[PDB]
Design a protein around this ligand. Structure first.
Ligand SMILES: Nc1ncnc2c1ncn2[C@@H]1O[C@H](C[C@@H](N)CC[C@H](N)C(=O)O)[C@@H](O)[C@H]1O
Ligand SMILES: Nc1ncnc2c1ncn2[C@@H]1O[C@H](C[C@@H](N)CC[C@H](N)C(=O)O)[C@@H](O)[C@H]1O
Lengths: 353, 361
């Protein structure tokens, strides 16, 4: 059993780690981690000169980074270094493997703590519009992942899908945001016809503009509320990348996806890998982060519209049964070894007319 | 590490760092959940319940069940709350409730957990200062200052009268007989209230640069009938006090001054010959290498960067920061004219050194 002293030490260490996460976030947004990755052991003043930043701020940052045992400090020379084995997963050189990106979510969630606490008392939720910086960062992260992996890694999970897209299909991306997924697919698959759907006017406008700029005649964008969608047998392929669990009306959205698919069509839904049973998530890395992100964003945004409030950790078992309730009788869950965060749900609609 | 060379310590691998950093992200989330549990009274509620459902916990706390459920999820994966899948019941083990609830007094670690969101709220402002210099003004931190008073208040209620004041040989006797006492950088006036209640024969003045702290203290005095407690608004860097006080106390105010050396000079001047300064400030070394590995060090450098240092730099100040340290504190006491200085420590407050500085008679 854990003692009072052991727990006290463990929680104090958690306090220090929360602080360290904020320092890493600052080091990412300032460019200090990138700067340090390109330098030999250097003084605070040297690092600040190289970074283009105020030395007094750099100095205090380095101090916490050193007590956190990320940055290494030699008292003899007053020099600091970022060892290469840490630098690799904390810098922009790593693209979407840059773990420092995730650290930014600590402040983003902290910014809404007081609003979220109020909802414990008064109900409702914090509206979607309160989180613009959070949404911008999420779109940037998904963008980088799509650039790295959508065409060559993700779509080939679905047996026969690349050939289907090469031959030419009608494809829709539901909750398309920026339109990065639509743009990449429209470039890779000239014979296919792609529609991004989103309820954000700004998203739709942006996608349309980006298509026009690239001369992508096969990429179009439409504003719809996915819960009110009207489309019957329009698409061979529907993709949904993290756009179900935040929904006000997830069951209706899923039913509308089923209805929008042609007989013989396929849904690729990408969403968060977790169990619907709490006990299974204990001890899995990032579980606490996922429940916290849920409480403070994904769940509360849905509850702000009197929605379902399924949350980020809605989990595989519930996702699978909700796909069944939507009409899908053929559902497979794929995983990629290097992706611990997402499940890839492949739901096929029967060919019967 | 090839396996071919003896090394003084474990060389951490890319993988192992990955796992450590991910666990830090989880720990940050857990801190936020504990902060939320403190502010909602959920930790307190659970501490006087047997194992219970999400619905039962919500009912007992008077809160929305859907929020409590998601909270309980994260508290369980963070291994604070325990979940029994057989009965769908949650419980807060007593050994943990003993340091996460108001009833634990000065051992309630849920209080410091509130810092994460508070520093999170200013992160973007602080990042701007890395590029543009200056700092984030003190007025950007209204809630963070309530945290500060909650934290200091735990130590004051537990230790001020019976442990702290007795650290100065003969001070309690002097106070019982009657002395003139000032608390510089007083805040809400918790310490002044406790002293004036304990020592009816002594006169106590709280001084702070906030008019509503001053009027808070002043109201609370008339409301409690403490005629021997008063409060005055001044900036500590510009005072006309000369031989006004037998005793001056300063609790965690020196290191965030714009002009700390000037403030210490003013304290020296304000003391009568043979008087005493009790300066309580953060326990740490002025040498970075000494702080590596000490619990709460990263927390201290982080709060410094994002509050204590930046508020001083906002005023074109010294920016000594939270971790200014024992060596610099002692030399700055020397510079200000204090030739007799001892550093004490107490069990009820791991975060602070108690500097006792005497002015020659
Ligand atoms: N009810 C809705 N109807 C249409 N779009 C919605 C609805 N609810 C949320 N959204 C959009 O769904 C997207 C949710 C995003 N998290 C997914 C964005 C995108 N697929 C990505 O991977 O970056 C946002 O662009 C929202 O504007
Ligand atoms: N230059 C100044 N003049 C007057 N007060 C100041 C000055 N600089 C900082 N402060 C005050 O210093 C106090 C610093 C607090 N950390 C301590 C409050 C209180 N002594 C406590 O232990 O809770 C705040 O109440 C500020 O209002």
């Amino acid at each position: 059993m854990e003692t009072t002293e052991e727990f006290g030490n463990r929680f104090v260490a958690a306090i220090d780690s929360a602080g360290l996460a904020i320092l890493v976030s600052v080091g990412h947004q300032t460019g200090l981690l990138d700067t340090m990755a390109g330098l030999p052991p250097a003084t605070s003043m040297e690092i600040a000169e190289a970074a283009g930043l105020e030395e007094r701020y750099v100095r205090e940052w380095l101090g916490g980074m050193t007590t956190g045992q990320i940055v290494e400090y030699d008292a003899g020379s007053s020099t600091y270094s970022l060892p290469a084995h840490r630098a690799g997963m904390l810098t922009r050189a790593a693209g979407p493997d840059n773990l420092a990106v995730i650290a930014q979510f600590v402040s983003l969630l902290g910014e809404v703590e007081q609003k979220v606490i109020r909802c414990f008392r008064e109900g409702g939720g914090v509206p979607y519009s309160e989180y613009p910086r959070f949404h911008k960062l999420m779109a940037e992260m998904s963008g980088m992942v799509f650039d790295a992996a959508l065409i060559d890694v993700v779509l080939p999970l679905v047996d026969g899908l690349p050939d289907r897209l090469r031959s030419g299909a009608d494809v829709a991306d539901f909750g398309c945001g920026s339109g990065r997924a639509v743009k990449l697919m429209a470039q890779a698959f000239g014979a296919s016809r792609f529609t991004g759907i989103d309820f954000s006017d700004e998203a739709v406008a942006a996608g349309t503009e980006e298509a026009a700029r690239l001369g992508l005649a096969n990429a179009t964008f439409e504003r719809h509320d996915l819960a009110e969608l009207d489309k019957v047998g329009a698409y061979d392929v529907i993709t949904v990348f993290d756009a179900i669990h935040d929904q006000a009306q997830p069951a209706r959205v899923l039913q509308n996806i089923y209805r929008a698919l042609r007989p013989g069509g396929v849904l690729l839904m990408v969403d968060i890998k977790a169990s619907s049973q709490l006990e299974d998530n204990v001890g899995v890395p990032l579980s606490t982060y996922l429940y916290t992100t849920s409480l403070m964003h994904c769940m509360t945004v849905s509850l702000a519209l009197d929605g379902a409030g399924l949350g980020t950790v809605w989990g595989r078992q519930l996702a699978t049964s909700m796909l069944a309730d939507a009409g899908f009788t053929d559902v497979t869950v794929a995983e990629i070894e290097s992706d611990v965060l997402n499940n890839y749900y492949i739901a096929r609609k029967l060919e019967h007319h």
